Design an enzyme around this catalytic site. Structure first.
Site, PDB file in Angstrom:
ATOM      1  CG  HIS A   1      -6.460   3.019  19.307  1.00  0.00           C
ATOM      2  ND1 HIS A   1      -6.164   1.633  19.519  1.00  0.00           N
ATOM      3  CD2 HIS A   1      -7.568   2.709  20.853  1.00  0.00           C
ATOM      4  CE1 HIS A   1      -6.300   1.060  20.783  1.00  0.00           C
ATOM      5  NE2 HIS A   1      -7.247   1.694  21.211  1.00  0.00           N
TER       6      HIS A   1
ATOM      7  CG  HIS B   1      -4.313  -2.208  18.280  1.00  0.00           C
ATOM      8  ND1 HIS B   1      -4.223  -0.911  18.886  1.00  0.00           N
ATOM      9  CD2 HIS B   1      -3.474  -2.978  18.981  1.00  0.00           C
ATOM     10  CE1 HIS B   1      -3.545  -0.957  20.086  1.00  0.00           C
ATOM     11  NE2 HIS B   1      -3.172  -2.213  20.472  1.00  0.00           N
TER      12      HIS B   1
ATOM     13  CG  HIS C   1      -6.526   0.183   9.089  1.00  0.00           C
ATOM     14  ND1 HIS C   1      -5.219   0.327   9.685  1.00  0.00           N
ATOM     15  CD2 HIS C   1      -6.488   0.467   7.784  1.00  0.00           C
ATOM     16  CE1 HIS C   1      -4.439   0.699   8.766  1.00  0.00           C
ATOM     17  NE2 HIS C   1      -5.170   0.619   7.421  1.00  0.00           N
ATOM     18  CB  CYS C   2      -6.255   1.117  15.000  1.00  0.00           C
ATOM     19  SG  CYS C   2      -4.989   1.506  15.964  1.00  0.00           S
ATOM     20  CG  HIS C   3      -1.156   2.722  10.266  1.00  0.00           C
ATOM     21  ND1 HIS C   3      -0.080   2.294  10.191  1.00  0.00           N
ATOM     22  CD2 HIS C   3      -1.568   3.174   9.218  1.00  0.00           C
ATOM     23  CE1 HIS C   3       0.057   1.927   8.942  1.00  0.00           C
ATOM     24  NE2 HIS C   3      -0.708   2.742   8.102  1.00  0.00           N
ATOM     25  CB  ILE C   4      -1.411   0.079  16.629  1.00  0.00           C
ATOM     26  CG1 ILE C   4      -1.190   1.521  17.296  1.00  0.00           C
ATOM     27  CG2 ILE C   4      -0.869  -1.122  17.452  1.00  0.00           C
ATOM     28  CD1 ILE C   4      -1.735   1.840  18.551  1.00  0.00           C
TER      29      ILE C   4
ATOM     30  CG  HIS D   1       2.488   0.468   4.947  1.00  0.00           C
ATOM     31  ND1 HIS D   1       1.384  -0.324   5.270  1.00  0.00           N
ATOM     32  CD2 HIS D   1       1.951   1.542   5.294  1.00  0.00           C
ATOM     33  CE1 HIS D   1       0.164   0.184   5.538  1.00  0.00           C
ATOM     34  NE2 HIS D   1       0.686   1.494   5.392  1.00  0.00           N
TER      35      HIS D   1
ATOM     36  CG  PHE E   1      -9.410  -1.191  16.300  1.00  0.00           C
ATOM     37  CD1 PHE E   1     -10.899  -0.984  16.670  1.00  0.00           C
ATOM     38  CD2 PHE E   1      -8.450  -0.429  17.159  1.00  0.00           C
ATOM     39  CE1 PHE E   1     -11.164  -0.161  17.458  1.00  0.00           C
ATOM     40  CE2 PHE E   1      -9.041   0.593  18.241  1.00  0.00           C
ATOM     41  CZ  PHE E   1     -10.467   0.647  18.469  1.00  0.00           C
TER      42      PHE E   1
ATOM     43  CG  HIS F   1      -2.388  -2.572   3.902  1.00  0.00           C
ATOM     44  ND1 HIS F   1      -3.156  -3.118   4.552  1.00  0.00           N
ATOM     45  CD2 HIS F   1      -2.614  -1.329   4.207  1.00  0.00           C
ATOM     46  CE1 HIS F   1      -3.859  -2.219   5.257  1.00  0.00           C
ATOM     47  NE2 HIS F   1      -3.601  -1.094   5.011  1.00  0.00           N
TER      48      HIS F   1
ATOM     49  CG  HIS G   1      -1.574   1.320   1.423  1.00  0.00           C
ATOM     50  ND1 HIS G   1      -2.398   1.687   0.531  1.00  0.00           N
ATOM     51  CD2 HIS G   1      -1.601   1.976   2.463  1.00  0.00           C
ATOM     52  CE1 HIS G   1      -3.124   2.873   1.212  1.00  0.00           C
ATOM     53  NE2 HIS G   1      -2.546   3.151   2.409  1.00  0.00           N
TER      54      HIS G   1
ATOM     55  CG  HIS H   1      -6.572   2.707   3.022  1.00  0.00           C
ATOM     56  ND1 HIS H   1      -6.225   1.725   2.335  1.00  0.00           N
ATOM     57  CD2 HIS H   1      -6.262   2.619   4.052  1.00  0.00           C
ATOM     58  CE1 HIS H   1      -5.318   1.118   2.983  1.00  0.00           C
ATOM     59  NE2 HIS H   1      -5.464   1.225   4.150  1.00  0.00           N
TER      60      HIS H   1
ATOM     61  CG  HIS I   1       0.036   5.500   4.825  1.00  0.00           C
ATOM     62  ND1 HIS I   1      -0.600   4.747   5.994  1.00  0.00           N
ATOM     63  CD2 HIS I   1      -0.318   6.971   5.190  1.00  0.00           C
ATOM     64  CE1 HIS I   1      -1.252   5.733   6.647  1.00  0.00           C
ATOM     65  NE2 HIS I   1      -1.093   6.683   6.336  1.00  0.00           N
TER      66      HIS I   1
ATOM     67  CG  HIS J   1      -4.490   5.350   7.389  1.00  0.00           C
ATOM     68  ND1 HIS J   1      -4.485   6.811   6.709  1.00  0.00           N
ATOM     69  CD2 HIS J   1      -4.300   4.739   6.430  1.00  0.00           C
ATOM     70  CE1 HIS J   1      -4.243   6.442   5.486  1.00  0.00           C
ATOM     71  NE2 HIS J   1      -4.006   5.268   5.448  1.00  0.00           N
TER      72      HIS J   1
HETATM   73 CU   LIG Z   1      -5.296   0.804  18.009  1.00  0.00          CU
HETATM   74 CU   LIG Z   2      -3.459   4.321   3.757  1.00  0.00          CU
HETATM   75 CU   LIG Z   3      -3.947   1.000   5.641  1.00  0.00          CU
END
Ligand SMILES: [Cu+2]
Ligand SMILES: [Cu+2]
Ligand SMILES: [Cu+2]
Ligand SMILES: *[C@@H]1O[C@H](CO)[C@@H](O[C@@H]2O[C@H](CO)[C@@H](O)[C@H](O)[C@H]2NC(C)=O)[C@H](O)[C@H]1NC(C)=O
Ligand SMILES: *[C@@H]1O[C@H](CO)[C@@H](O[C@@H]2O[C@H](CO)[C@@H](O)[C@H](O)[C@H]2NC(C)=O)[C@H](O)[C@H]1NC(C)=O
Length: 497
Positions: free
Chosen positions: A397, A458, A452-455, A110, A463, A112, A65, A402, A67, A400
């Site tokens: 958290h 998670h 989604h959460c980017h941790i 990164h 998440f 995905h 992906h 897309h 980002h 993010h």
């Molecule tokens: Cu999180």
């Molecule tokens: Cu993204």
């Molecule tokens: Cu993403």
């Protein structure tokens, strides 16, 4: 060297030792972080990704992906596995062929798929502006002014045991740093500046989890860009940067020629700087080659506060200036229990058929789409508001979206919304218990967009939801190449699905 906008990119396994501890990794371009992919605003990127992975302990499939790049009309190139494509299998390649109209700034790429980016597939992605309105604020902006912040683990991502707490073993700044335990005096990164010049430092969190308190002893930092969005100048002496966020800041090399510590304190893992953990070196040309002797203050004078940021352009806020003042006002119930996260009562588990492919095959309402309850339709050409009230364990958290950036109408730790001039960005901390971080955007980009959460740990634990934006126009808006159509048959055959 930077690569792109047309380039091959090979994804391989190799051993690396960025903190003195050797482990296998998943790498783009043979390095951690991967090479910078770069071009100019509006360019056609064609990144032909060659999956050469052979070690199943880090997964031999992959998907990448880009980002923060909107992918308008190219949803199939966005990269989230089982949202917009099936993964690329080993021994095959895939051309991510897209354009970046209307965007210029600091991004990253990164894996995905699963938690694979934690195993090393992460790197910077810069879209320069030949007519940048900030150009006169600095002298130097190149590969030497990119600063990546990364968490690094000795345990492989797929091998993190179920039921035990996950924390990193080192902070890496520009790919180097020292381990929190069994610390050895492995090399630190050096960022070199010349006295009197001004630098556009492009600060990129490529973190899988922690946020960092970033500072440079003796210096302050003038923010000019937030997640791709030009900002008014904001001078700070510390930046709390959450996973996947970016800032550009002007660094004025206006201190005595010398060595200064660069500090990146994660919110988990090793605390402090003993033995040179959490550290890099800012070295002026002509300085002695030795470690800095500087210290941080006890208390920073001008930390970044998100509500202090404002766009450079007159971006405003879509909709009406009150809560719920949007065509489609949403409030998500974000929760955690028993090892899994949920959004409105549903934990995300990737589907067998990617959401985009389900839509192209004729599934045209979001209740029709798998996973059930994880796909929410958005209407076209509409103002969307999404309130993201915090409280779920494991915070803060960083959420993010897309396909979009968004106005941050309400930020962490401040109950007051801003319907006038908040910053726009693509990844936002939702804060602490009782907060009501809220985002707004307009739907002008048909396709399924992950929220989604980017941790990453998670995300893996559920998440996430998918916004199926303008389902009716998704097929007409996003013509797909044959190679994309070939991905799921090849993947499902390789995996006996
Ligand atoms: Cu999180
Ligand atoms: Cu993204
Ligand atoms: Cu993403
Ligand atoms: C966050 O803000 C949203 C609105 O953006 C709040 O949503 C309202 O919630 C109440 C129940 O708590 C409902 O009666 C309303 O219909 C919702 N929308 C409105 C008034 O516009 C939400 O309560 C806020 N959450 C927190 C924790 O402060
Ligand atoms: C909390 O957030 C609010 C809203 O973003 C901030 O209020 C703004 O403050 C600036 C600076 O004084 C004023 O120009 C604006 O008129 C305010 N807007 C609103 C809607 O009130 C506020 O400063 C933040 N609090 C802190 C402590 O930073």
């Amino acid at each position: 060297a930077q690569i792109g906008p047309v380039t091959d990119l090979h994804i391989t396994n190799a051993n690396i030792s960025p903190d003195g501890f050797s482990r296998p990794a998943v790498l783009a371009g043979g390095t951690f972080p991967g090479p910078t992919i770069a071009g100019n605003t509006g360019d056609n990127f064609q990144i032909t990704v060659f999956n050469d992975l052979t070690d199943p302990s880090m997964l031999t499939d992959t998907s990448i992906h880009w980002h923060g790049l909107f992918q308008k009309g190219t949803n199939w190139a966005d990269g989230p596995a089982f949202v917009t494509q099936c993964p690329i299998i080993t021994g095959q390649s895939f051309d991510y062929n897209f354009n970046v109209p209307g965007q210029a700034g600091t991004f990253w790429y990164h894996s995905h798929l699963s938690t694979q980016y934690c195993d090393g597939l992460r790197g910077p992605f810069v879209v320069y502006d030949p007519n940048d309105p900030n150009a006169s604020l600095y002298d130097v902006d190149d590969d030497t002014t990119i600063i990546t912040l990364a968490d690094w683990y000795h345990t492989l991502a797929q091998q993190e045991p179920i039921g035990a707490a996950i924390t990193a073993d080192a902070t890496l700044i520009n790919g180097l740093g020292r381990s929190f335990t069994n610390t050895t005096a492995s090399p630190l990164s050096v960022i070199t500046v010349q006295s009197g010049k001004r630098y556009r430092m492009r600060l990129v969190s490529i973190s899988c989890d922690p946020n960092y308190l970033f500072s440079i002893d003796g210096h302050d930092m003038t923010i000019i860009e937030v997640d791709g969005v030009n900002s008014q100048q904001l001078t700070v002496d510390q930046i709390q940067i959450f996973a996947a966020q970016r800032y550009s800041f002007v660094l004025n090399a206006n201190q005595p020629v010398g060595n200064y510590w660069i500090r990146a304190q994660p919110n988990s893992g090793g605390q402090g700087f003993d033995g040179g953990i959490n550290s890099a070196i800012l070295r002026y040309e002509g300085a002695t080659v030795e470690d800095p002797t500087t210290t941080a203050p006890t208390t920073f004078s001008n930390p970044l506060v998100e509500t202090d940021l404002h766009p450079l352009a007159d971006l405003g806020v879509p909709g009406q200036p009150f809560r719920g003042g949007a065509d489609d006002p949403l409030v998500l119930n974000l929760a955690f229990a028993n090892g899994r996260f949920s959004i409105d009562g549903v934990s995300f588990v990737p589907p067998t058929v990617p959401v985009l492919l389900q839509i192209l095959s004729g599934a045209q309402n979001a209740q029709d789409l798998l996973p059930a309850g994880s796909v929410i339709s958005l209407p076209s050409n509409s103002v969307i508001e999404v309130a993201l009230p915090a409280g779920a364990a494991g915070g803060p958290h960083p959420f993010h979206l897309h396909g979009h950036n968004f106005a941050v109408v309400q930020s962490a730790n401040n109950a007051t919304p801003n319907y006038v001039n908040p910053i726009w960005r693509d990844t936002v901390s939702i804060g602490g218990t009782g907060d009501n971080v809220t985002i707004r955007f307009t739907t002008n980009n048909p396709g399924p967009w992950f929220l989604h959460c980017h941790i990453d740990w998670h995300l893996e634990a559920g998440f996430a939801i998918v916004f199926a934006e303008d389902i009716p126009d998704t097929a007409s808006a996003n013509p797909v190449p044959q190679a994309w159509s070939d991905l799921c048959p090849a993947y499902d055959q390789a995996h006996n699905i």
